Amino acid sequence: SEVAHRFKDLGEENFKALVLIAFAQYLQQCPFEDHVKLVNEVTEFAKTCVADESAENCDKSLHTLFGDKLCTVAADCCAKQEPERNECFLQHKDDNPNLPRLVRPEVDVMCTAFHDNEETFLKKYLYEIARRHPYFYAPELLFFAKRYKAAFTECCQAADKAACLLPKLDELRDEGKASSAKQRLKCASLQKFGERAFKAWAVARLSQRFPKAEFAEVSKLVTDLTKVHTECCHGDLLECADDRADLAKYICENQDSISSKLKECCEKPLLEKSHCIAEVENDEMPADLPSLAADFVESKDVCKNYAEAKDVFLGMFLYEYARRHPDYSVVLLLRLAKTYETTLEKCCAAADPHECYAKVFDEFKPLVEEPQNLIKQNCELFEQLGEYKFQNALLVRYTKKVPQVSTPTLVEVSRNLGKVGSKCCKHPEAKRMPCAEDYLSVVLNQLCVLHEKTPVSDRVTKCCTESLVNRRPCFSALEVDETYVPKEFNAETFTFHADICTLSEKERQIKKQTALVELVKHKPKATKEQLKAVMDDFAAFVEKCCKADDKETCFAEEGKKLVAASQAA
């Protein structure tokens, strides 16, 4: 009995949660009520199995069981067999579910709902997040849950809860968003590019954090980790949670053979342990390390070893280069690595392999410098323009590159693109390029998935599917789409009403930024000079109409003077 197996291992609490999560992630439209129902029905069935490990259908796989229970409330999909059925659900997850924004009631009401019924208050939190982020890292979600719990438990019995809770709740919303992004990138790697891509990443990333670990150790960690994520991304939430626990055990037992910063971590609760380990800082770089050139370019056995076990060889390359380079970003390392592989591929087929791959490290020089330059700049522009204007600039810029992309997606992706600026540009010259180029891969992945749903720009497709590591470089190359046919103006699209006045300070910027998009889609060839100039008139008018007697009509009148002056420029 599989269900029985996992249950013992996870216990009722987590098992219950994981299953709630898996359901909210497969049927994001269904109400809370119905999920909760099915979860209980399933949980009790599991109980009967622990005992009689041969009762009803304790023999069946998780999918069959989970699938049949969802099929009692959903159709094509359910009209299928396994694994076909299961794959169906996976393909129908919505990365942008049409769901109501989530508004939080006043502090008082929350604390009351929390104190009265705690389990419910938390089960609904898990539900509202699982359904919106169908790819959120299950295990990690439970961790956020606890942290969420501790938030209320502590703030609801203080002097000023509003002052105690609201902050901790924001810090969580953000970090929870950052978390979802990363895990999304992760699933994307595996699903669109295969495990070979995910592994390479893992090797480089781990090697950077565990410099003292042995290649053979890393590979093992890498092999396990993959399986963990390969499962979660595929919806095998229970086993993913199980295996992820194992891994945390193993790492803790073999501490000395891996890293010396893993002490603090292994001395705490399961959920807090895994979270801790996953975010441990890089161990101190081993002192006397030979030169890479030695075993990787000077040696004359290069092509021999490469042909023997191509992957392990490259796998070693990576591990070697990475471990002594925590100042490099995982993608950059991956590029270099990919460059090396290409060199060996063409060189090992030459008369004198050695001469050919002799200067491969000269090839690297350009690659390391480009990212460096780009950031040095844009962060020099961030320090100047400020966050908002900086997002605007990026807005103009990306719209010009891929005009087809839907206004909403562009606005979103660009706002995020601009946060990277606030996040990375504060660090020192040295720490700038990593932060930025790795974050950019998370964000740009956002653009890629949202777009994959309803493709409209071949230029976006190519850049997203050609190479995972090269994405940022691909998009940066694009300038303006010369074949784009400019859009014709729509009255409705540029009509500002008074309802924008009630909207928060940000929701406004969001409006103005959505306007700027439409403008550019209308005037591709327009210039940054004109655009700024025009943006000024608008600002000058929201203030007017919004504070001018009983006028829901100044929106039609003041807006007329707007479009008029707008059609002119």
Nearer to ligand 1FL, 89 or 439 (CB): 439
Alpha carbons 42 and 40: distance in angstroms, whole number: 5
SS3 165: helix
The residue behind tokens 């390359």 is 317
Q: 226: closest CA among 179, 189, 255?
A: 189
Nearer to ligand 1FL, 247 or 411 (CB): 247
* Structural contact between residues 428 and 73, judged by C-beta atoms closer than 8 angstroms: no
Number of chain positions touching ligand 1FL (CB under 6 A):
40
Q: 296: closest CA among 355, 361, 214?
A: 361
- 475 makes contact with ligand 1FL (CB under 6 A): yes
Nearer to ligand 1FL, 378 or 392 (CB): 378
- 344 makes contact with ligand 1FL (CB under 6 A): no
Min CB(311)–ligand 1FL separation in Å: 8
Among 222, 276, 425, 534, binds ligand 1FL (CB under 6 A): 425
Nearer to ligand 1FL, 89 or 317 (CB): 317
Residue 234: both structure tokens together: 């595929």
Min CB(330)–ligand 1FL separation in Å: 9
Among 3, 181, 344, 417, binds ligand 1FL (CB under 6 A): 417
- 367 makes contact with ligand 1FL (CB under 6 A): no
Q: 516: closest CA among 421, 388, 417, 375?
A: 388
Task: Report the alpha-carbon angle 508-510-513, nearest 5.
Answer: 110
Spell out the long-range contacts of 560-565 with Cβ–Cβ below 8 A and sequence spacing 24 or more.
562/494, 562/496, 562/537, 562/538, 563/489, 563/491, 563/494, 563/495, 565/537
The torsion of the CA quartet 134, 140, 145, 147, rounded to 10 degrees, works out to -140
- 399 makes contact with ligand 1FL (CB under 6 A): no
Min CB(5)–ligand 1FL separation in Å: 20
Residue 32, phi then psi, degrees to nearest 5: -60, -45
Q: Report how far Cα 226 is from the mean position of its chain's Cα atoms.
A: 17
Among 148, 382, 538, 555, binds ligand 1FL (CB under 6 A): 382
Segment interacting with ligand 1FL (CB under 6 A) among 292-300, 320-328, 331-339, 451-459: 331-339
- 440 makes contact with ligand 1FL (CB under 6 A): yes
* Structural contact between residues 282 and 434, judged by C-beta atoms closer than 8 angstroms: no
Min CB(199)–ligand 1FL separation in Å: 8
Q: 443: closest CA among 337, 276, 331?
A: 331
Q: Which of residues 22-81 bind ligand 1FL (CB under 6 A)?
A: none
Q: Annotated binding residue at 133?
A: no
Q: Annotated binding residue at 246?
A: yes
Q: Annotated binding residue at 458?
A: no
HEC secondary structure over 74-130: CCCHHHCCCCHHHHHHHHCCCCCCCCCCCCCCCHHHHHHHHHHCHHHHHHHHHHHHH
- 375 makes contact with ligand 1FL (CB under 6 A): yes
- 244 makes contact with ligand 1FL (CB under 6 A): yes
- 196 makes contact with ligand 1FL (CB under 6 A): yes
Site mask, ligand 1FL, residues 201-240, x = CB under 6 A? ----xx--x---------------x--x------------
Among 24, 334, 395, 396, binds ligand 1FL (CB under 6 A): 334
* Structural contact between residues 372 and 433, judged by C-beta atoms closer than 8 angstroms: yes
Q: Annotated binding residue at 116?
A: no
Segment interacting with ligand 1FL (CB under 6 A) among 156-164, 211-219, 320-328, 374-382: 374-382
Among 197, 252, 266, 449, binds ligand 1FL (CB under 6 A): 197
Calculate the alpha carbon distances from 342 to 140, 328, 336 in Å. Answer: 37, 20, 10
The torsion of the CA quartet 482, 483, 489, 493, rounded to 10 degrees, works out to -80
Packing angle of the helix pair 270-278, 237-253 (nearest 10 deg): 80
Answer left, alpha or beta for residue 334, where phi above 0 means left and psi between -120 and 50 means alpha: alpha
Q: Annotated binding residue at 63?
A: yes
Site mask, ligand 1FL, residues 301-330, x = CB under 6 A? -------------x---x------------
Output the known binding site for Ca(2+): 2, 9, 231, 236, 239, 242, 246
Output the known binding site for (4Z,15Z)-bilirubin IXalpha: 227
Output the known binding site for Zn(2+): 63, 234, 236
Residues that bind ligand 1FL (CB under 6 A): 193, 196-197, 200, 205-206, 209, 225, 228, 244, 247-248, 274, 277-278, 280, 314, 318, 334, 337-338, 341, 374-375, 378-379, 382, 417, 420-421, 424-425, 436, 440, 467-470, 475-476
